[PDB]
């Protein structure tokens, strides 16, 4: 959704140990709570904290696809190349919900597929 | 939470200014500081040089940076009327004329109340005694030491019993020893501090306090400074007193009135010493008399000392009558 | 090896607070006033900005502005306890914002070439915002150490 | 995720979105994204007030569904006559949430594993940050990062709603401002000088009319023609767009810092360590959060809430032009916002 | 003459200098007061950043007040729409709205740490004086404490001798030794009442039957503790902030100056003897003048009767106790 040159100026390469410290400790920690409706204050024992991956975090997967094992299949899904175009079309520039905190608006992630050269 | 109402009324114009110099109005903070000073002076005789005990009892009564004051003072009703009246001993530098300088001030009369409240009866009585002593023996505001800002009580409504209102000069003089004895007894009963340590007060206090009377008048219109010329035949009580003060014959001194026997800003030395003589005006049985209150102390100011006999010889010269002691 | 800036912050705060405690152990008033000034300084910085706070420190010191070099300030040469505390606070803040915990340390200082007051005088607002964050952090560390190990009032 | 509703939050009074998981110089900070520092309201906190407010309206029978009153006691009885009194006793003893709330927000903590809620309350991000200015007393400040994040939000609702026409409203925004530059209306620029003063800085003004007009139109489409009490055109000239780091500095410094004390009646002064600082979101700040609506997963749903569309209109009709409390300090008149329910 | 220096960065230094000389108009009072502080230098070789010092750079005090009010008066329209929105917020909740005028001078937030060594509660957006709702709740609670102590001083002391002895021991430990001084007065009664309302709220059930007269109606202790809430139960009454009505913001000034003239300051601080020396050093603090009208609003959450009782008690508190600084000198008093 943004030009890549606009974000090239904010890319930093750090040593392996320094990057490890960022991954361990710079992740978000949120102190969730529940409140007793009648009393209006925090219910007894109702306090738990969670850890979240920070937003604007770029992660890459690697989907390996083979020939469809099940036979009796239409010609449009004949080979893997036919299967690949189905995944690319239906998933390029699409928003998913990985992990579950959906009811509190957590986990949304932009997905952009694409084969290499 | 006992209460005490004091309905004051200024017999002479009051010069009490807030942040704005031109605008003059009654200020609770200024009068509270003045009551603090008057309580320190009046109870100074019972303390003498006991500075620490006096500071402790003052922080008790009027609060400090570690405890809220248990006495709350607020002005409720103000029937004031801003007007122009001249300064007592300040004259303009006009070429030839050199008349008086008249700033804005509260007009004479202007009955305004002053409300006292406290949670302790003893502290309320102490505050009331200090305030009534301040009202009787002095004024409030600018140039109070030279006959300005003096008031008298028009009505009283308090729960804790206080000293009776004097009716003449003898009762007014006896009221000094009265108030001193009552505050001494109250402090000895409640605080139980040092019992009249024998030492002259290093500051202005009642250890060496004398009350003087000079002149009498029947009409208030002929009391405060009215004539702008010395040769004028319509000189009032304040004007006549100022004329007598200007005459160097009465007071025996090398520099006369211009010496350091009075307020510091006179001559080369500026400093901040005020005049030990506190000129005021008191009304006794519808008769107005000039009140000359003089506070004698061991040391005039750190660095120099002055001869106190100049004030007394001046009072004897123009026939000032010492009512107290 | 790398050292986190928080370690330098803690070391500098402990060094300055221990130094004032050891030098003026007898002076209870100095320690109390310094603790109060350290706890009140961050609010002043937030309300009026870092440069205004730095100048207001010098206003009580009676020293004039535009001759403000922190290296040329003898904080013990002031008679009043309030002046002593203000001089100590200003010197510590300026030293942190100009040199950090030393050249060899992880934090070499933000301004690094002149007094931070002059830095605020003639530099852009992003740099003064960075300096404000640094000053707030070091002030928090110093306030913690003072409230812990220094006598209050 | 069938339909998505955008909720606009405008702070009438300072809002202390409590964090309670960190300590700072000015104590009691607010919840912010760690890597950016921009003040946000996490979805869990925002959902809680919405769910709590929804409960009172239903329990007092104030929710208007399809322009009709919702008698939950009979509605639960008609739907769940098998255990109508058993379920009523659970909510009578506050052990369970009422019928409508469990359908919309989700079942109470007692019945955690029965099903899932039909609402996905997104986090509330900063949209307009009021910053003091010389002329034009306070300017609504926005950053390229904020609108870029707003653009992705419009992409998300477009994908959810399958409406590309809404995916190109703000697609014509691409600005690269330096730190000393800004895009602001005439009301903020000083007369006779191409410079603006935003509470600590002098910024040269960059001239491009469409950027503010594009943003102004977006809010007009999002929240109608009434900007929480004033016309949008009256505020179109007060909007300023500043650089990325300039906006970050403003949110980290211009937030309200309030000093509070506890007075012990024994002495009459502040108690021993009875003073603390509380950080508040400034008044007149704008925060938005999408409210995604899925298929209600409860069994035997009433015909009035069976589909997502019937849920969406009920949510809009009950949480539009209303006032809620966000964060702590409820009893001292803090954290009150005026909410607007808008659909793209 | 005098020299004025600004500790702000370049460019903005010249702009603020132009702003203070009234060359360019200023619309936000808080910004010009805080982030554009002028460091006025007198004949002394120092730049005093005090309100008294910055007063000098004007013609006189009246010019200062007029300039401040003119800066405040420019934002009248935005503040008016904000006040309309705030009033609309009041009407949403079933709140009670009453208006009182400043019988005497009022100053809130005198103690915040500012460069001027003094401050005033000014709105961050429109630069107008206002009373935070926390202050209203605190003054209402403390007036309730005082009324309770005066009405039933010794009774609750008999009921709660254990906690009063604990408090006396705590005071003894803090205050030198004072092993058994412990004056059983209104101060200690208020202290033990506050301790009951803050850490021993459960013990208040015994005294919940008691009622205290406020204004005309009576209010129970249980009603009070429900109004103000405890460490385990949220308060049932919302205390909104107080703002001046914008109608009068154009005719009469909403801000004015006041004077602090501490004679004998060395006597109070360094222990020097009193008398006719120690030349006083005066400094000034801003304060809203008397007669300024304010709007107050309190909203309940369970019972509207609780809201009306809180409104009556708060009205009495502002009438007698007063809010803000110098409440012991008659400051911050209101009347119908």
mmCIF file with all atom_site columns, C-alpha atoms in Angstrom, chain C:
data_model
loop_
_atom_site.group_PDB
_atom_site.id
_atom_site.type_symbol
_atom_site.label_atom_id
_atom_site.label_alt_id
_atom_site.label_comp_id
_atom_site.label_asym_id
_atom_site.label_entity_id
_atom_site.label_seq_id
_atom_site.pdbx_PDB_ins_code
_atom_site.Cartn_x
_atom_site.Cartn_y
_atom_site.Cartn_z
_atom_site.occupancy
_atom_site.B_iso_or_equiv
_atom_site.pdbx_formal_charge
_atom_site.auth_seq_id
_atom_site.auth_comp_id
_atom_site.auth_asym_id
_atom_site.auth_atom_id
_atom_site.pdbx_PDB_model_num
ATOM 1   C CA . UNK C 1 1   ? 30.646 -5.361 23.437 1.00 0.00 ? 1   UNK C CA 1
ATOM 2   C CA . UNK C 1 2   ? 27.558 -3.141 23.370 1.00 0.00 ? 2   UNK C CA 1
ATOM 3   C CA . UNK C 1 3   ? 26.114 -1.308 26.370 1.00 0.00 ? 3   UNK C CA 1
ATOM 4   C CA . UNK C 1 4   ? 22.520 -0.129 26.652 1.00 0.00 ? 4   UNK C CA 1
ATOM 5   C CA . UNK C 1 5   ? 21.903 3.576  27.213 1.00 0.00 ? 5   UNK C CA 1
ATOM 6   C CA . UNK C 1 6   ? 19.835 2.766  30.313 1.00 0.00 ? 6   UNK C CA 1
ATOM 7   C CA . UNK C 1 7   ? 22.967 1.433  32.017 1.00 0.00 ? 7   UNK C CA 1
ATOM 8   C CA . UNK C 1 8   ? 24.778 4.712  31.331 1.00 0.00 ? 8   UNK C CA 1
ATOM 9   C CA . UNK C 1 9   ? 21.740 6.609  32.623 1.00 0.00 ? 9   UNK C CA 1
ATOM 10  C CA . UNK C 1 10  ? 21.721 4.634  35.872 1.00 0.00 ? 10  UNK C CA 1
ATOM 11  C CA . UNK C 1 11  ? 25.488 4.966  36.298 1.00 0.00 ? 11  UNK C CA 1
ATOM 12  C CA . UNK C 1 12  ? 25.425 8.741  35.785 1.00 0.00 ? 12  UNK C CA 1
ATOM 13  C CA . UNK C 1 13  ? 22.454 9.232  38.112 1.00 0.00 ? 13  UNK C CA 1
ATOM 14  C CA . UNK C 1 14  ? 24.015 7.095  40.845 1.00 0.00 ? 14  UNK C CA 1
ATOM 15  C CA . UNK C 1 15  ? 27.357 8.865  40.437 1.00 0.00 ? 15  UNK C CA 1
ATOM 16  C CA . UNK C 1 16  ? 25.888 12.354 40.774 1.00 0.00 ? 16  UNK C CA 1
ATOM 17  C CA . UNK C 1 17  ? 23.538 11.488 43.650 1.00 0.00 ? 17  UNK C CA 1
ATOM 18  C CA . UNK C 1 18  ? 26.272 9.666  45.573 1.00 0.00 ? 18  UNK C CA 1
ATOM 19  C CA . UNK C 1 19  ? 28.619 12.594 44.928 1.00 0.00 ? 19  UNK C CA 1
ATOM 20  C CA . UNK C 1 20  ? 26.190 15.147 46.351 1.00 0.00 ? 20  UNK C CA 1
ATOM 21  C CA . UNK C 1 21  ? 25.382 12.868 49.300 1.00 0.00 ? 21  UNK C CA 1
ATOM 22  C CA . UNK C 1 22  ? 29.061 12.363 50.150 1.00 0.00 ? 22  UNK C CA 1
ATOM 23  C CA . UNK C 1 23  ? 30.132 15.981 49.643 1.00 0.00 ? 23  UNK C CA 1
ATOM 24  C CA . UNK C 1 24  ? 27.263 17.531 51.625 1.00 0.00 ? 24  UNK C CA 1
ATOM 25  C CA . UNK C 1 25  ? 26.400 14.778 54.106 1.00 0.00 ? 25  UNK C CA 1
ATOM 26  C CA . UNK C 1 26  ? 26.216 17.308 56.947 1.00 0.00 ? 26  UNK C CA 1
ATOM 27  C CA . UNK C 1 27  ? 24.058 19.679 54.879 1.00 0.00 ? 27  UNK C CA 1
ATOM 28  C CA . UNK C 1 28  ? 20.581 18.209 55.360 1.00 0.00 ? 28  UNK C CA 1
ATOM 29  C CA . UNK C 1 29  ? 18.951 21.293 53.831 1.00 0.00 ? 29  UNK C CA 1
ATOM 30  C CA . UNK C 1 30  ? 21.021 20.998 50.646 1.00 0.00 ? 30  UNK C CA 1
ATOM 31  C CA . UNK C 1 31  ? 20.035 17.352 50.190 1.00 0.00 ? 31  UNK C CA 1
ATOM 32  C CA . UNK C 1 32  ? 16.354 18.052 50.819 1.00 0.00 ? 32  UNK C CA 1
ATOM 33  C CA . UNK C 1 33  ? 16.272 21.025 48.458 1.00 0.00 ? 33  UNK C CA 1
ATOM 34  C CA . UNK C 1 34  ? 18.101 19.067 45.754 1.00 0.00 ? 34  UNK C CA 1
ATOM 35  C CA . UNK C 1 35  ? 15.644 16.181 46.087 1.00 0.00 ? 35  UNK C CA 1
ATOM 36  C CA . UNK C 1 36  ? 12.677 18.554 45.829 1.00 0.00 ? 36  UNK C CA 1
ATOM 37  C CA . UNK C 1 37  ? 14.190 20.321 42.816 1.00 0.00 ? 37  UNK C CA 1
ATOM 38  C CA . UNK C 1 38  ? 14.933 17.012 41.092 1.00 0.00 ? 38  UNK C CA 1
ATOM 39  C CA . UNK C 1 39  ? 11.366 15.812 41.642 1.00 0.00 ? 39  UNK C CA 1
ATOM 40  C CA . UNK C 1 40  ? 9.921  19.133 40.452 1.00 0.00 ? 40  UNK C CA 1
ATOM 41  C CA . UNK C 1 41  ? 12.194 19.648 37.428 1.00 0.00 ? 41  UNK C CA 1
ATOM 42  C CA . UNK C 1 42  ? 10.530 17.243 34.917 1.00 0.00 ? 42  UNK C CA 1
ATOM 43  C CA . UNK C 1 43  ? 7.152  18.953 35.340 1.00 0.00 ? 43  UNK C CA 1
ATOM 44  C CA . UNK C 1 44  ? 8.760  22.328 34.615 1.00 0.00 ? 44  UNK C CA 1
ATOM 45  C CA . UNK C 1 45  ? 10.439 20.893 31.511 1.00 0.00 ? 45  UNK C CA 1
ATOM 46  C CA . UNK C 1 46  ? 7.131  19.481 30.273 1.00 0.00 ? 46  UNK C CA 1
ATOM 47  C CA . UNK C 1 47  ? 5.205  22.694 30.943 1.00 0.00 ? 47  UNK C CA 1
ATOM 48  C CA . UNK C 1 48  ? 7.700  25.280 29.672 1.00 0.00 ? 48  UNK C CA 1
ATOM 49  C CA . UNK C 1 49  ? 10.251 23.366 27.588 1.00 0.00 ? 49  UNK C CA 1
ATOM 50  C CA . UNK C 1 50  ? 13.832 22.307 28.201 1.00 0.00 ? 50  UNK C CA 1
ATOM 51  C CA . UNK C 1 51  ? 15.426 25.643 27.307 1.00 0.00 ? 51  UNK C CA 1
ATOM 52  C CA . UNK C 1 52  ? 13.130 27.578 29.628 1.00 0.00 ? 52  UNK C CA 1
ATOM 53  C CA . UNK C 1 53  ? 13.964 25.171 32.457 1.00 0.00 ? 53  UNK C CA 1
ATOM 54  C CA . UNK C 1 54  ? 17.701 25.498 31.813 1.00 0.00 ? 54  UNK C CA 1
ATOM 55  C CA . UNK C 1 55  ? 17.485 29.297 31.804 1.00 0.00 ? 55  UNK C CA 1
ATOM 56  C CA . UNK C 1 56  ? 15.289 29.302 34.924 1.00 0.00 ? 56  UNK C CA 1
ATOM 57  C CA . UNK C 1 57  ? 17.965 27.262 36.688 1.00 0.00 ? 57  UNK C CA 1
ATOM 58  C CA . UNK C 1 58  ? 20.438 30.028 35.839 1.00 0.00 ? 58  UNK C CA 1
ATOM 59  C CA . UNK C 1 59  ? 17.963 32.737 36.883 1.00 0.00 ? 59  UNK C CA 1
ATOM 60  C CA . UNK C 1 60  ? 18.130 31.553 40.496 1.00 0.00 ? 60  UNK C CA 1
ATOM 61  C CA . UNK C 1 61  ? 21.909 31.156 40.157 1.00 0.00 ? 61  UNK C CA 1
ATOM 62  C CA . UNK C 1 62  ? 22.011 34.920 39.334 1.00 0.00 ? 62  UNK C CA 1
ATOM 63  C CA . UNK C 1 63  ? 24.385 34.127 36.458 1.00 0.00 ? 63  UNK C CA 1
ATOM 64  C CA . UNK C 1 64  ? 23.527 35.825 33.149 1.00 0.00 ? 64  UNK C CA 1
ATOM 65  C CA . UNK C 1 65  ? 22.538 34.057 29.946 1.00 0.00 ? 65  UNK C CA 1
ATOM 66  C CA . UNK C 1 66  ? 24.743 33.893 26.800 1.00 0.00 ? 66  UNK C CA 1
ATOM 67  C CA . UNK C 1 67  ? 27.651 33.164 29.166 1.00 0.00 ? 67  UNK C CA 1
ATOM 68  C CA . UNK C 1 68  ? 26.389 29.802 30.327 1.00 0.00 ? 68  UNK C CA 1
ATOM 69  C CA . UNK C 1 69  ? 29.225 27.310 29.818 1.00 0.00 ? 69  UNK C CA 1
ATOM 70  C CA . UNK C 1 70  ? 28.527 24.530 32.307 1.00 0.00 ? 70  UNK C CA 1
ATOM 71  C CA . UNK C 1 71  ? 32.226 23.659 32.543 1.00 0.00 ? 71  UNK C CA 1
ATOM 72  C CA . UNK C 1 72  ? 32.791 27.205 33.858 1.00 0.00 ? 72  UNK C CA 1
ATOM 73  C CA . UNK C 1 73  ? 30.353 26.856 36.785 1.00 0.00 ? 73  UNK C CA 1
ATOM 74  C CA . UNK C 1 74  ? 31.584 26.125 40.307 1.00 0.00 ? 74  UNK C CA 1
ATOM 75  C CA . UNK C 1 75  ? 28.395 24.789 41.949 1.00 0.00 ? 75  UNK C CA 1
ATOM 76  C CA . UNK C 1 76  ? 29.935 24.915 45.444 1.00 0.00 ? 76  UNK C CA 1
ATOM 77  C CA . UNK C 1 77  ? 30.695 28.655 45.155 1.00 0.00 ? 77  UNK C CA 1
ATOM 78  C CA . UNK C 1 78  ? 27.124 29.647 46.106 1.00 0.00 ? 78  UNK C CA 1
ATOM 79  C CA . UNK C 1 79  ? 26.301 30.463 49.712 1.00 0.00 ? 79  UNK C CA 1
ATOM 80  C CA . UNK C 1 80  ? 22.598 29.643 49.725 1.00 0.00 ? 80  UNK C CA 1
ATOM 81  C CA . UNK C 1 81  ? 21.419 26.041 49.934 1.00 0.00 ? 81  UNK C CA 1
ATOM 82  C CA . UNK C 1 82  ? 18.812 26.680 47.232 1.00 0.00 ? 82  UNK C CA 1
ATOM 83  C CA . UNK C 1 83  ? 21.523 28.106 44.978 1.00 0.00 ? 83  UNK C CA 1
ATOM 84  C CA . UNK C 1 84  ? 23.710 25.063 45.681 1.00 0.00 ? 84  UNK C CA 1
ATOM 85  C CA . UNK C 1 85  ? 20.906 22.660 44.771 1.00 0.00 ? 85  UNK C CA 1
ATOM 86  C CA . UNK C 1 86  ? 20.012 24.580 41.609 1.00 0.00 ? 86  UNK C CA 1
ATOM 87  C CA . UNK C 1 87  ? 23.660 24.707 40.525 1.00 0.00 ? 87  UNK C CA 1
ATOM 88  C CA . UNK C 1 88  ? 24.056 20.968 41.123 1.00 0.00 ? 88  UNK C CA 1
ATOM 89  C CA . UNK C 1 89  ? 20.895 20.173 39.160 1.00 0.00 ? 89  UNK C CA 1
ATOM 90  C CA . UNK C 1 90  ? 21.837 22.430 36.246 1.00 0.00 ? 90  UNK C CA 1
ATOM 91  C CA . UNK C 1 91  ? 25.392 21.084 36.109 1.00 0.00 ? 91  UNK C CA 1
ATOM 92  C CA . UNK C 1 92  ? 24.204 17.465 36.148 1.00 0.00 ? 92  UNK C CA 1
ATOM 93  C CA . UNK C 1 93  ? 21.573 18.056 33.458 1.00 0.00 ? 93  UNK C CA 1
ATOM 94  C CA . UNK C 1 94  ? 23.943 19.987 31.195 1.00 0.00 ? 94  UNK C CA 1
ATOM 95  C CA . UNK C 1 95  ? 26.736 17.442 31.664 1.00 0.00 ? 95  UNK C CA 1
ATOM 96  C CA . UNK C 1 96  ? 24.389 14.607 30.718 1.00 0.00 ? 96  UNK C CA 1
ATOM 97  C CA . UNK C 1 97  ? 23.045 16.425 27.664 1.00 0.00 ? 97  UNK C CA 1
ATOM 98  C CA . UNK C 1 98  ? 26.509 17.539 26.485 1.00 0.00 ? 98  UNK C CA 1
ATOM 99  C CA . UNK C 1 99  ? 28.838 14.612 27.268 1.00 0.00 ? 99  UNK C CA 1
ATOM 100 C CA . UNK C 1 100 ? 26.637 11.769 28.508 1.00 0.00 ? 100 UNK C CA 1
ATOM 101 C CA . UNK C 1 101 ? 28.495 9.305  30.711 1.00 0.00 ? 101 UNK C CA 1
ATOM 102 C CA . UNK C 1 102 ? 31.825 10.114 29.050 1.00 0.00 ? 102 UNK C CA 1
ATOM 103 C CA . UNK C 1 103 ? 33.370 9.722  25.617 1.00 0.00 ? 103 UNK C CA 1
ATOM 104 C CA . UNK C 1 104 ? 34.350 6.085  26.197 1.00 0.00 ? 104 UNK C CA 1
ATOM 105 C CA . UNK C 1 105 ? 30.857 5.292  27.501 1.00 0.00 ? 105 UNK C CA 1
ATOM 106 C CA . UNK C 1 106 ? 27.999 4.033  25.349 1.00 0.00 ? 106 UNK C CA 1
ATOM 107 C CA . UNK C 1 107 ? 26.284 7.441  25.536 1.00 0.00 ? 107 UNK C CA 1
ATOM 108 C CA . UNK C 1 108 ? 28.739 10.099 24.353 1.00 0.00 ? 108 UNK C CA 1
ATOM 109 C CA . UNK C 1 109 ? 26.244 12.948 24.708 1.00 0.00 ? 109 UNK C CA 1
ATOM 110 C CA . UNK C 1 110 ? 23.681 14.473 22.373 1.00 0.00 ? 110 UNK C CA 1
ATOM 111 C CA . UNK C 1 111 ? 24.973 18.012 21.817 1.00 0.00 ? 111 UNK C CA 1
ATOM 112 C CA . UNK C 1 112 ? 28.651 16.886 22.105 1.00 0.00 ? 112 UNK C CA 1
ATOM 113 C CA . UNK C 1 113 ? 30.149 20.213 21.015 1.00 0.00 ? 113 UNK C CA 1
ATOM 114 C CA . UNK C 1 114 ? 28.720 23.013 23.158 1.00 0.00 ? 114 UNK C CA 1
ATOM 115 C CA . UNK C 1 115 ? 26.420 23.751 26.078 1.00 0.00 ? 115 UNK C CA 1
ATOM 116 C CA . UNK C 1 116 ? 22.877 22.340 25.677 1.00 0.00 ? 116 UNK C CA 1
ATOM 117 C CA . UNK C 1 117 ? 21.422 25.807 26.316 1.00 0.00 ? 117 UNK C CA 1
ATOM 118 C CA . UNK C 1 118 ? 23.158 27.062 23.170 1.00 0.00 ? 118 UNK C CA 1
ATOM 119 C CA . UNK C 1 119 ? 22.049 23.864 21.419 1.00 0.00 ? 119 UNK C CA 1
ATOM 120 C CA . UNK C 1 120 ? 18.439 24.781 22.161 1.00 0.00 ? 120 UNK C CA 1
ATOM 121 C CA . UNK C 1 121 ? 19.250 28.374 21.167 1.00 0.00 ? 121 UNK C CA 1
ATOM 122 C CA . UNK C 1 122 ? 20.364 27.658 17.606 1.00 0.00 ? 122 UNK C CA 1
ATOM 123 C CA . UNK C 1 123 ? 19.064 24.253 16.504 1.00 0.00 ? 123 UNK C CA 1
ATOM 124 C CA . UNK C 1 124 ? 15.904 22.748 15.039 1.00 0.00 ? 124 UNK C CA 1
ATOM 125 C CA . UNK C 1 125 ? 12.934 21.525 17.056 1.00 0.00 ? 125 UNK C CA 1
ATOM 126 C CA . UNK C 1 126 ? 13.454 17.816 16.353 1.00 0.00 ? 126 UNK C CA 1
ATOM 127 C CA . UNK C 1 127 ? 16.853 17.962 18.054 1.00 0.00 ? 127 UNK C CA 1
ATOM 128 C CA . UNK C 1 128 ? 15.410 19.849 21.025 1.00 0.00 ? 128 UNK C CA 1
ATOM 129 C CA . UNK C 1 129 ? 12.663 17.211 21.275 1.00 0.00 ? 129 UNK C CA 1
ATOM 130 C CA . UNK C 1 130 ? 15.298 14.463 21.348 1.00 0.00 ? 130 UNK C CA 1
ATOM 131 C CA . UNK C 1 131 ? 17.149 16.439 24.020 1.00 0.00 ? 131 UNK C CA 1
ATOM 132 C CA . UNK C 1 132 ? 13.893 16.823 25.961 1.00 0.00 ? 132 UNK C CA 1
ATOM 133 C CA . UNK C 1 133 ? 13.353 13.057 25.944 1.00 0.00 ? 133 UNK C CA 1
ATOM 134 C CA . UNK C 1 134 ? 16.941 12.502 27.085 1.00 0.00 ? 134 UNK C CA 1
ATOM 135 C CA . UNK C 1 135 ? 16.598 15.113 29.836 1.00 0.00 ? 135 UNK C CA 1
ATOM 136 C CA . UNK C 1 136 ? 13.324 13.612 31.057 1.00 0.00 ? 136 UNK C CA 1
ATOM 137 C CA . UNK C 1 137 ? 14.860 10.131 31.211 1.00 0.00 ? 137 UNK C CA 1
ATOM 138 C CA . UNK C 1 138 ? 17.973 11.236 33.095 1.00 0.00 ? 138 UNK C CA 1
ATOM 139 C CA . UNK C 1 139 ? 15.815 13.369 35.402 1.00 0.00 ? 139 UNK C CA 1
ATOM 140 C CA . UNK C 1 140 ? 13.661 10.335 36.183 1.00 0.00 ? 140 UNK C CA 1
ATOM 141 C CA . UNK C 1 141 ? 16.757 8.299  37.049 1.00 0.00 ? 141 UNK C CA 1
ATOM 142 C CA . UNK C 1 142 ? 18.205 11.097 39.194 1.00 0.00 ? 142 UNK C CA 1
ATOM 143 C CA . UNK C 1 143 ? 14.869 11.620 40.958 1.00 0.00 ? 143 UNK C CA 1
ATOM 144 C CA . UNK C 1 144 ? 14.646 7.903  41.730 1.00 0.00 ? 144 UNK C CA 1
ATOM 145 C CA . UNK C 1 145 ? 18.161 7.784  43.165 1.00 0.00 ? 145 UNK C CA 1
ATOM 146 C CA . UNK C 1 146 ? 17.662 10.994 45.162 1.00 0.00 ? 146 UNK C CA 1
ATOM 147 C CA . UNK C 1 147 ? 14.341 9.846  46.620 1.00 0.00 ? 147 UNK C CA 1
ATOM 148 C CA . UNK C 1 148 ? 16.037 6.561  47.520 1.00 0.00 ? 148 UNK C CA 1
ATOM 149 C CA . UNK C 1 149 ? 19.408 7.513  49.006 1.00 0.00 ? 149 UNK C CA 1
ATOM 150 C CA . UNK C 1 150 ? 19.158 11.259 49.766 1.00 0.00 ? 150 UNK C CA 1
ATOM 151 C CA . UNK C 1 151 ? 17.525 12.763 52.843 1.00 0.00 ? 151 UNK C CA 1
ATOM 152 C CA . UNK C 1 152 ? 14.206 14.474 52.121 1.00 0.00 ? 152 UNK C CA 1
ATOM 153 C CA . UNK C 1 153 ? 12.555 17.390 53.940 1.00 0.00 ? 153 UNK C CA 1
#
